[PDB]
Design a protein around this nucleic acid. Structure first.
Ligand code: CL
Lengths: 76, 77
DNA sequence: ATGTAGACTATAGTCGACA
DNA sequence: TTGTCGACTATAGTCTACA
């Protein structure tokens, strides 16, 4: 059960909630499917870098900021 | 082509060269195929988080450090 | 609003062969 | 040593509907 993947999905959900988005909102902005967004947040599905990039765009967060948050989660 | 993917593969190759590894060495350690390692570095192939995780392990670099380097590349040029 | 189900497509990732 | 091509298997990512 992948450590990094679980940190990545955690950061995605955390950012999503801060911005008050629904999964559907993020799906729309990400150009991804709602169910796949759920799969990622809930079941730690293994997304690609491209899909992560689209999600970062959809969440309206810079990659830099995203990875900064990600580093912070890993450090705990 | 994808901006982020190109930064990721760049960091991977850069680390690989610093450690004096061949693609084959990294394939072995990563538990990935040599040709896929080539695909990533050369053709910006779209790896998953799991495969990136395995590569980070194969390169013997912490995720933290990897993403620190990655942030630095993004901040340029 | 979210998660699961299932069936279906595109492509991740393997493998042998050779330049 | 690396990159490629092509063929194969595994799974990311889609879509519909429903509790
Ligand atoms: Cl070069």
């Amino acid at each position: 059960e992948s450590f990094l993947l679980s940190k990545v999905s955690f950061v995605i959900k955390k950012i999503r909630l801060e911005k008050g988005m629904t999964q559907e909102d993020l799906a729309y902005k990400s150009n991804l499917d709602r169910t796949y967004i759920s799969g990622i947040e809930r079941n730690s599905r293994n997304l690609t870098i491209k899909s992560l990039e689209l999600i970062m765009k959809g969440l309206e967060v810079s990659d830099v900021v995203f990875f900064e948050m990600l580093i912070k989660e890993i450090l705990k």
